[PDB]
């Protein structure tokens, strides 16, 4: 019978959750990019108004 | 019969979604670049006005 390694099964679980956070990583930065761009839209909208 | 690995099928699914976010990644940054450039257009338009 194979005797599973307590270290090995621990790391493999963490790598599974690691991939999930690496994916939530991008989603968070999508919300950051579009917020910055849409903010720059607002600060150029009033700049034309002063023109 | 092949016995699919619960870890393997989990990661392969995440890699599929990973590629999709890596693609939405670019689209978000396109919206950031053109917002910055068009904002710089506005802040040079009024600069000529002061001239």
Residue numbers in the entry:
A (entry chain PB), B (entry chain PA): 612 to 662
Pull text from the paper.
N4-like phages have a genome size of about 75 kb, nearly twice that of T7, and encode around 70–90 ORFs, including a characteristic large virion-associated RNA polymerase (vRNAP) unique to this family of bacterial viruses. The massive 3,500-residue vRNAP 18,19, present in 4 ± 1 copies inside the mature virion 20, is ejected into the host upon infection. In this study, we use a complementary top-down and bottom-up approach by determining the cryo-EM structures of both the full-length recombinantly expressed vRNAP and the fully asymmetric N4 virion tail.
We purified N4 virions to homogeneity and determined the high-resolution structure of phage N4 tails from filled virions (FV) and empty particles (EP) to 3.2 Å and 3.6 Å, respectively. The tail has a total vertical length of 450 Å, formed by the HT-adapter (gp67), tail tube (gp54), and tail plug (gp53), and is attached to the head through interactions between the HT-adapter and the portal (gp59). Tails from EPs are remarkably similar in structure to FVs, and comparison of the similarly resolved maps identified three critical differences after the genome is ejected from the capsid. First, the portal undergoes two major changes: the collapse of the barrel helices beyond residue 667 20 and the narrowing of the portal tunnel from 33 Å to 25 Å due to restructuring of the tunnel loop.
